[PDB]
Design a binder for this molecule. Structure first.
Ligand code: HEC
Length: 125
């Protein structure tokens, strides 16, 4: 859906920014510094889940640019695996949120976080 590569770069960076916000805003809850309201969390995780599926389609062929490493394109299969694992961890977070269990949530949150990091290590400049 993009006219120039720059437009895909801007879309994905935007999507990733939103994801960051929706994920990162739960840190105080998870650490116990903010109160835990199951419903609030469930709903935030629902938004997070939607957002988390969005960036990937904006790393299509010829969208080189931004802080994305070329390896994303040279090593597509490995990138895809990285994204799938990430999304899978997201499913897990969602399950924890739906169960309204802080322990499970904390654990799941950590797993999501390691997944973001694993990708960045390999594919973000
Ligand atoms: C690979 C499968 C990734 C996963 C999982 C996550 N991120 Fe990442 N992120 C990735 C790339 C290749 C890039 C660079 C994109 C570019 O074209 O510039 C990024 C970038 C970000 C950013 C920066 C956004 C901006 O303002 O430019 C943020 C804030 C970011 N990523 C955060 C983030 C978080 C919080 C994740 C887990 C919830 C996450 N990313 C997963 C690749 C991948």
């Amino acid at each position: 859906q993009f006219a120039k590569p720059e437009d895909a770069v801007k879309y994905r960076q935007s999507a990733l920014t939103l994801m960051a916000s929706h994920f990162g805003r739960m840190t105080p809850v998870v650490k116990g510094q903010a109160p835990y309201d199951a419903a609030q969390i469930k709903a935030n995780v629902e938004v997070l889940k939607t957002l988390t599926a969005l960036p990937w389609a904006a790393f299509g062929p010829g969208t080189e640019g931004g802080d994305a490493r070329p390896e994303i394109w040279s090593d597509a299969a490995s990138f895809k695996q990285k994204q799938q694992a990430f999304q899978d961890n997201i499913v897990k977070l969602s399950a924890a949120a739906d169960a309204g269990d802080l322990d499970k949530l904390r654990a799941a949150f950590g797993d999501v976080g390691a997944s973001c990091k694993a990708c960045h290590d390999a594919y973000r400049k």
